Amino acid sequence: ATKAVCVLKGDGPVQGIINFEQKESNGPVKVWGSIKGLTEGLHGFHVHEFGDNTAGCTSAGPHFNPLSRKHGGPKDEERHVGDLGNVTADKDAVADVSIEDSVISLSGDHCIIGRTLVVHEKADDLGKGGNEESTKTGNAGSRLACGVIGIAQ
Amino acid sequence: ATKAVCVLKGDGPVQGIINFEQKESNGPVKVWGSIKGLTEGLHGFHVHEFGDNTAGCTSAGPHFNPLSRKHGGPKDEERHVGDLGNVTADKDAVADVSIEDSVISLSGDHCIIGRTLVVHEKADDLGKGGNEESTKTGNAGSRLACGVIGIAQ
Ligand SMILES: [Zn+2]
Ligand SMILES: [Zn+2]
Ligand SMILES: [Zn+2]
């Protein structure tokens, strides 16, 4: 089994730890952990292309999209590899993250190791929004916290 | 070419940006950038195995050592893949980093993407120090700053 880990940090109150586990090379990736300091509601949750934090989360670039697809939700065929949908925060400002995804990987051309995980200001509309930006970013707003996805023990 | 980047952060502030560039997978990696907030003298400079900064630089584990070798300097045949020797800080507290290395890579089994770059408290004795610790850590002492090595544009 392969494992990875990401420490989310930013300029404000948002911080988290996210774990990745892939039992088999061809298999789904379990994503789990916790994020604190979030407003109640949905927050866009994406793997962005670059593991570049030189200028904070802006340097991470666009959604990781090795197959040149449009933006969607994790359960859509038409999605970026990086499209992990939304995490949900309650009034406690905590999002408990528990995802299984078949499109990201910890090896090969879908590999997310060395790329950046970002949690966003607003909801990702999963490409179903009423504008052009829906099909590109999902209108999830600014980047609250991010980290480079690293190889774990 | 393949490129990677690492933001070093630690108490001080010890703060640096280190760039990696590899023209070809069978070629050397150029490593360059700047680190500020260091004491004058040599500081051990290593790639550690895990890109895990969960509990700070300690979570990164030992020197990256995929070939099960002993610790050495970058010029030694007998070294860990992660053994990049020392960076030198002047009285200005700045280390200007300019390294070329044939053993690290940005792809394959010696790939350092998703691992942690660490700058150390003391000099790495390059395995010539003559105690047991020399052949394992190089006696470079505590971890001042670290970051996960990410894929760059
Ligand atoms: Zn995003
Ligand atoms: Zn997307
Ligand atoms: Zn070593």
Brief account:
The PDB classes it as oxidoreductase. Two copies of one chain form a homodimer. Chain A has 153 residues and is mainly beta.
What does this structure look like?
The structure is a homodimer of 153-residue chains. Chain A has 153 residues and is an all-beta fold. Chain A has a single domain, classed as Immunoglobulin-like, CATH 2.60.40. The first copy, chain A, is built from no helices and 10 strands. Chain A has a 5-stranded antiparallel β-sheet, with no helix packed on it. A 4-stranded antiparallel β-sheet of chain A has the order 6-4-8-9, with no helix packed on it. Chain A starts with a strand and ends with a strand. Bound molecules: zinc ion (3 copies). One zinc ion binds at residues 44, 46, 48, 118, 120, 140 of chain A.
What is the CA–CA distance across the termini of chain A? 10 Å
Name the CATH superfamily classification of chain A: Superoxide dismutase, copper/zinc binding domain
Largest sheet of chain A: 5 strands, antiparallel
List the chains of the largest interface with their residue counts: A-B, 22 and 22 residues
The arrangement of helices and strands of chain A along the chain is EEEEEEEEEE
Protein structure class of chain A: mainly beta
Number of structural domains of chain A: 1
Largest beta sheet of chain A: what is the strand line-up?
Answer: 7-3-2-1-10
Strand percentage of chain A lies at 35-45%
Bound molecules: zinc ion
CATH topology of chain A, by name, is Immunoglobulin-like
- Overall spatial form of chain A: globular
Rg calc of chain A:
14 Å
Number of helices of chain A: 0
PDB class: oxidoreductase
Keywords: SOD1, ALS, Drug discovery, oxidoreductase
Assembly: dimeric
Entry title: G93A mutant of human SOD1 in P21 space group
